[PDB]
């Protein structure tokens, strides 16, 4: 890579390593290749959110034009959030698009993603189905996000009323992961979730 990009990523990688937030296990970044062009990120779910106790891994690709264009970031760990695709992990956030500034760093990108988890913007969604659930039934969204944090991100056990519906459909012979996606997507309507599973 160009020297300006190598120096920036080197500096920013070490800043994260020595940061207060890494020492409190809030954020982390690790190398994948050798030329600093792909990194692996990790953030903790913010406290007092459904993601609390979960850890989320991030795919980070540094462009040849860095620092004048943002890193491409994607959620490896599946998450239930209006601004992150529950299928691909793609992120809708302005600093990763038009509001990137060259002064931004890996550290502030990681901290900004943690802030996004704590404060969704459902009117600028990446996942229309999740954003609709967030706005129409906040409590259902919260418990569903807690469930996904537990199942995919290592968070503590989620609510028992939702586990009951999961077991009912698993008792029908369906895969537990597909049952979770179907019930989450159908806002926990057992009948439409069953029909979706019966057509997979």
């Amino acid at each position: 890579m160009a020297n300006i990009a190598v120096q920036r990523i080197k500096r920013e990688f070490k800043e994260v390593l020595k940061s207060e937030e890494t020492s409190k296990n809030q954020i982390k970044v690790d190398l994948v290749d050798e030329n600093f062009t792909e990194l692996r990120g990790e953030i903790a779910g913010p406290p007092d959110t459904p993601y609390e106790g979960g850890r989320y891994q991030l795919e980070i690709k540094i462009p040849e034009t860095y620092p004048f264009n943002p890193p491409k970031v994607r959620f490896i760990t599946k998450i239930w959030h209006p601004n992150i695709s529950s299928v691909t992990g793609a992120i809708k956030l302005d600093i990763l698009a038009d509001q990137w500034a060259a002064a931004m760093t890996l550290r502030t990108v990681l901290l900004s993603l943690q802030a996004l988890l704590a404060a969704a913007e459902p009117d600028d969604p990446q996942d229309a189905v999740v954003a609709n659930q967030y706005k129409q039934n906040p409590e259902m969204f919260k418990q569903t996000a807690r469930l996904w944090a537990h199942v995919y991100a290592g968070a503590p056990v989620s609510s028992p009323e939702y586990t009951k519906k999961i077991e009912n459909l698993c008792a029908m012979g369906f895969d537990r992961n597909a049952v979770i996606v179907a019930l989450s997507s159908k806002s926990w309507d057992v009948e439409t979730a069953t029909e979706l599973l019966l057509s997979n």
């Binding site: 809708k92 956030l93 302005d94 698009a97 038009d98 509001q99 913007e121 600028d124």
Partner: protein, 76 residues
């Protein structure tokens, strides 16, 4: 020719335009008058949103017609 643009706040924007002016041109004139960036501008006439590349005469917009300005993009 003079047209009117109605806004959220009741304050009407008065513009001087030509029938051949494009919707993009109209949005540029609104930026000059009001400061609103064209990307945040949605123009409504005859119940439908007008697209930037077409002219006022294409939509049969004549003298003293009223357009509706809906303000939002901010699409992060």
């Amino acid at each position: 020719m003079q047209i009117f643009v109605k806004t959220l706040t009741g304050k009407t924007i008065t513009l001087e335009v030509e029938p051949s002016d494009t919707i993009e041109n109209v949005k540029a004139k609104i930026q000059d008058k009001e400061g609103i960036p064209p990307d945040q501008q949605r123009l409504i006439f005859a119940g439908k949103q007008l697209e930037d590349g077409r002219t006022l005469s294409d939509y049969n917009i004549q003298k003293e017609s009223t357009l509706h300005l809906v303000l939002r993009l901010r699409g992060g």
